[PDB]
Symmetry: D2
Subunit: 248 residues, 4 copies
């Protein structure tokens, strides 16, 4: 019951890590809104999760479109109650180095990750600040803390999210809204994990002291801790959940 | 039941944050060994905690004395079972800058913090490695991540613990032992917090959240890091600091 | 003579820190290209600097416009020689928190800082990689390492630059191109310094003063120099102790 | 002449990186004192360096012995003038994980690195603070910023130095003494480099090579110089990109 009486909106909640966050949040007693670019996916996943009295509802929105994400959060609150938590999990990745990256792809990666975090937070903050209560979990990555070959826009975007999190915590922690970033290591099994996939495999695994990559469930547990009132003194943190990657 | 079937030794467990960690760990179903320089206090605190079927036992040891901390860990395991977790909470603080610090005072702060973490971990690691299962939580501080005026030895000590944590995670994460460091902000109410007490408003201003931490705040982070829900968390310097290191 | 036979392009070179970098680089024997949104300013500043045989030339370009910045870099190389160094100094700042920021202003701040760094680097990298020799200095800030109240877009932008720098170093260090970021503390006297204008502010700086454009320029000149041959991927704090406390 | 009228004491100055620092500092016009555990080595190295008008003097001291390091600094100042800079370069390394490290070896690694930095700085700070002028460069490592397998005591010691540097900068930057740490990557060619001696190790370095003593020396000379007047509290990675990935 660690999230009893919490109401959590999760962007990109239809699949992957976002969906695993939803499952764990429901386990802990929260009501959840899955907000995803793919409306059908958000609704199918919310149906799948709403067993045994658990309450999950789905909403379609592109986090890069201010009016759409704002409308989704408004609909979510009308449906499941005023938000107490927001997880800015929506993100995309792609390849391209500074010398050869496509400028349009660059912009889209920055938009979904950085602009989406900004716009979804902006929508949620109106209510959270009014109520002097909220918790926002942003999505960094090991790729936001160190450099990853051939991923210039993505490392820029996740780097932006890491420090934006610090900035938001500076503004809002004293006003009742905690803001933290989870920084996951590689999670292979999601759509993104598959997108980014022998000797080269072994070298990649060798960057992880724990000797395995992460699961969506591994990351979801850290997010559930940060959302909970047991983390009342945690704000502004870039919490590495990465099997040791950034420790070496 | 987040720590069901866990057996957790907590150095400095007799009081303050260590005691709060013990309370939360028992809440989550763990068996706890309080290991404290003050043997009587460890025992009395363990007795106090042991209600409602909760199992806490107290042991005396100075973490800077290898034979003594080794004996205490062995005795704990005889009493409550093989360790699954170790919290290196024992620490001392003090004042003194590089230009005026006394060498003996410097050495003692380094000893309890860094050498204690080393020796207590060394003792626990034999069993944890043998069983390919363990979780160690070390105690950094905001004072291990940034510089604090007039606390040279203490900032060096906590700085050491922060990077030693990364080093330990590098060695052991693949062998079944996670090692992490909680880095608390100021916690006023403990013996250490009291010891270190417009100057007030200035200190508070460094904390975006607008208050200092409680032992309970810190205990919750430690309980998370101890739990199997934190299975992919290792090598982390986890700031639990009201936003201090974010600005 | 620390930058003898070096050819350095400096975005935002017409004024402020960029101009101070130009002055110091010329002192050390470099030829410099001042690339500024304000073309007249770039030209006037370059002429002012071109004394005692020093070679400084001005170019007009908005770093957020790929064609324009690419053209300026191409012309710089035609004018003063193939680049050996690029300083992505161009940046803008503004105020606004997540809950109330102008989304258009947010985009412009991200564009000049992050996209400008990307596009200018992209143009320079063709030649630098072809020659297996280059040094790129990006502009972070203390605002890219910690959070600053009421500056969401700018902290996001400088945060991006800090980690983009690491990413660029990962790609290119082994190919002969070092990439580093200078992270300055507050520098009062520039246009940006004045725009953003406080014993409380000063209290954030252990050294007990804010920085000068010259302070920052010296760090950039070191990073540009071959004396810094093993320095790459670094986020170098030049900040009077700000991020140390 | 970047260090004209500077007077720099270098612990561990008789060989390796310390000696390279001495050479570069003399190049830039400083007077130097080499203070080394090996007195004869300090003397021989100082004599070797004292050509063409360069002034280098050697002294014997174990930095872990307060009386010895204090005497050496005093003797240095009698010979070459009041110190303006101190480089806490003396250090030792060794292997051992938490589970198997010998406690005596642990203490010795912690002592030379951390306690030596403390004691040497303490001796130098009396004069520097009295004059409201100094610059201190401590020696971290990539091993002070991240974990290195099988080097528990050394990683703890270098970690201590990195944050002690921040703490010292907090105390003294406003009192006229800058304090910074260089954090070098692997440097193969020194006594320590040889002691610790694969392609797997090299793969940790984006730049595709290990460092030289000269690479590290240049960063130290920059930090010592007044061109770095606003640089304090910094943990400056000079590491071929190691900590960037
Ligand atoms: N998979 C990894 O290895 C990994 C590692 C570190 C961090 N991350 C980060 O974790 C988060 C989740 O990653 P994942 O692996 O679960 O991703 P995923 O691609 O498996 O799932 C992402 C979900 O977000 C949605 N989405 C994409 N763009 C959107 C938009 N503009 N608006 C609303 N929704 C949108 C997708 O439709 C999708 O359902 C991301 O921010 C990602 O960058 C992933
Ligand atoms: N109180 C704070 O503000 C604060 C902030 C950040 C980090 N910390 C750290 O948290 C930890 C706990 O702090 P606290 O405020 O609870 O401390 P505390 O002084 O209130 O209590 C510490 C306990 O450790 C025991 N202890 C001391 N030396 C010991 C030794 N050599 N061997 C065994 N036990 C010993 C004491 O007897 C005591 O019971 C420490 O590592 C401390 O450095 C404290
Ligand atoms: N002044 C400070 O306190 C401070 C502190 C840390 C970092 N910085 C950073 O240092 C850099 C320089 O700052 P400054 O104080 O000298 O700035 P400034 O505003 O004084 O000067 C900036 C120059 O860049 C030019 N410029 C602006 N937009 C451009 C564009 N789209 N394309 C090309 N040129 C453009 C301007 O015309 C101007 O000449 C910036 O990246 C800034 O973010 C400044
Ligand atoms: N060589 C590397 O790969 C590397 C990398 C990063 C950092 N470092 C650090 O750089 C510094 C220099 O390393 P190096 O490779 O030149 O070492 P080195 O072993 O080659 O030389 C060190 C010198 O310090 C002296 N010394 C040792 N103990 C002393 C003591 N107790 N008191 C006074 N002098 C003492 C030695 O006599 C020796 O002349 C050290 O702090 C080291 O930890 C080295």
């Amino acid at each position: 019951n660690r999230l009893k009486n919490e109401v959590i909106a999760i962007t990109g909640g239809g699949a992957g890590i976002g969906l695993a966050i939803a499952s764990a949040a429901l386990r802990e007693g929260a009501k959840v809104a899955l907000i995803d670019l793919d409306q059908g996916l958000a609704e199918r996943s919310a149906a799948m999760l709403s067993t045994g009295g658990a309450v999950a509802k789905g909403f379609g929105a592109d986090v890069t479109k201010a009016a759409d994400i704002t409308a989704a959060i408004t609909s979510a609150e009308q449906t499941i109650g005023s938000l107490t938590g927001l997880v800015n999990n929506a993100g995309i990745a792609g390849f391209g180095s500074v010398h050869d990256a496509d400028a349009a792809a660059w912009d889209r990666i920055m938009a979904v990750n950085v602009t989406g975090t900004f716009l979804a937070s902006k929508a949620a903050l109106a209510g959270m600040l009014e109520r002097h209560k909220g918790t926002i979990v942003n999505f960094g990555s090991v790729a936001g803390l160190v450099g990853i070959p051939t991923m210039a826009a993505y490392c820029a975007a996740k780097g932006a999210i890491v420090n934006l999190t610090r900035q938001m915590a500076a503004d809002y922690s004293g006003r009742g809204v905690r803001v933290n970033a989870v920084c996951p290591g590689t999670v292979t099994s999601t759509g993104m994990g598959q997108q980014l996939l022998p000797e080269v495999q072994a070298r990649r695994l060798a960057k992880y002291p724990i000797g395995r990559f992460g699961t969506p469930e591994d990351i979801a547990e850290a997010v559930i801790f940060l959302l909970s009132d047991q983390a009342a003194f945690v704000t502004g943190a870039a919490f590495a959940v990465d099997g040791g990657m950034t420790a070496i």
